[PDB]
Amino acid sequence: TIHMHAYLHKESFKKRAPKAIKIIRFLAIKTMKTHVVKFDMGLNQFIWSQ
RNA sequence: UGAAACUGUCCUUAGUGCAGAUCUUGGUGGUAGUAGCAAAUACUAAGAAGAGGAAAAAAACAUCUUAGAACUGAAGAGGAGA
């Protein structure tokens, strides 16, 4: 579970959904040690759902 | 270094000697890798093409398709004329 409210606290509104992708990319780099991170289209559609 | 013209002496002649004219023309510095590349709400994911996202996150990647999210809001960022 990624508590993204912690990362997106008081962040500029026009950069909240784009930044959520940047955080999930970074959490995948630090855990699997790979720089080739591919998002499933279902996850991206959920990040932008609101 | 340069490869085809030139020099010394006596007279004659002058478009004859530059540091200045906010001089003329051309070239070039410091400033300085500095000031800046901040109006027009906004982009994201997958795929394709391409030399052109690599990597100890180098956090950003132009074009086209699809999906999401959006703006002009019909006296329009629409469709046409002088």
The type of residue at A45 is Q
Burial grade of A20 (CB within 10 A; 0-12, 13-18, 19 or more): buried
| Nucleotides of strand B under 7 angstroms from a protein beta carbon | 41-47, 54-57, 59-60, 67-69
Technique that determined the structure? cryo-EM
Q: Is the CB of A18 under 7 A from strand B?
A: yes
| Distance in angstroms: CA A49, C1' B37 | 34
Cα–Cα distance for residue pair A42/A7, rounded to 1 Å: 21
- Phi/psi of residue A43, each to 5°? -70, -45
**Contact indicator for A2, A23 with CB cutoff of 8 Å:** yes
